[PDB]
Amino acid sequence: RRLGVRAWVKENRGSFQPPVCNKLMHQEQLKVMFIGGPNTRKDYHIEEGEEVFYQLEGDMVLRVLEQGKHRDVVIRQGEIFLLPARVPHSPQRFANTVGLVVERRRLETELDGLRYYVGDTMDVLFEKWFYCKDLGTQLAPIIQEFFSSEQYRTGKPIPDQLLKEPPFPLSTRSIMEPMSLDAWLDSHHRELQAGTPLSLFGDTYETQVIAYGQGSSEGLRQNVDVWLWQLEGSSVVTMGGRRLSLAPDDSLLVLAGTSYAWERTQGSVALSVTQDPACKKPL
Template structure:
């Protein structure tokens, strides 16, 4: 299909199940403008990560804990099996995962002028910064490691606040209170009538994050074009997708990436339900 790859999510996770165990605990399904990754455990982090982009979480198996700093206070977000959660840009977060769990995480590629930050606090309540470092992150698995190693090499001699940037290249969001996770399958059940009537609904209406557009589509036909990558994940039923003159079937449990700047048409069968994910890197930028 013109270079497009269809993944059966269940089968792909089974083939790559060893990657979800320590020490790796993660596997990329796709990496370009969007990063589509699945993360296992156990994976306990002591740092908080701050980045310019937003993140979408969906727990496929088991539960995870996501400590965050929201409006100056530590908030522990529990994301349970089957739940989705949208984390806006520039909010410190520290993913904690236990064994025998699996979660989907979607984020975007950094632009060349963006920085990430890893930060450690002096206490469990995260009231004072012990140490932080800003850096460009192109590859999470590669670029976080030297920063973590540097912190632990200095840890025993650190003075709280000594290595806090006075003029950071990334401004932490101190204003946003993030809506709680919710169960995707219960949400679909509540909106099944609208979806069966052919409507396409916003999964996160009114959410403070403006990077992600995550839609749940019922049956019908549509012609589409996007200047950014689009991830399609079919939840129920089948769809026919035509791009570059070729047509393929996307069945329940399958997913694929539509490249940027492509025209494509979709025919969704009756009682089919699919997820559409886009992430605009300019969505949370302030002019």
């Protein structure tokens, strides 16, 4: 069950380049995916859940539509960033890079969208909305459809092929600045090692990425998955009658409906990643 993150990336190296630049490490309630390049594109993904971006190897550019403006969000190696719900985003990836993206299984009620815009404007050229189960797989025919369309050929939209309005309001939020994960962890070393687990992004998001130093934790049975990633030092997770030693860079997925006990050593640093749909933000 324990997976060394860079060891898993090495074993699956060939997956992080064209034609399919991604491989899911975990694919149940929590989608833990690793993506490579090159992949330069104009499609904008829209979803009701949030997306955690971390650059393991090399840099990437996340193009976003923020408060009526086009913005390029540069995410450098070692940087972490959280995208809120319903923000249109277009990830740009380069050769020999590896990024981690964390997203969640959609609720039966949630719709995903894919949009292409007219030139550099906010006018929609082409769009398709769908119920997402396996994103990359469902996106491929929509993209092929776009490249075969009158819309792509002419650069002009077909009004009858556009929705009157999106199925939900698009985000009105200001987009955060990506931050160095290591710099953030070192700056909060005193609070972390005093036994205070800390949320990287706070309570205004559904997602909870929490940093832990030395201490004890009890994981209760939840209807959501939890991904643990040991960054520095070691810890021990007691789960399903087994004691699993997490060495530096080891990760463990705690499946929904499983309880655990976590014992972290002095000077150790680890993360937990949770995207509980019950924590979805209103408005």
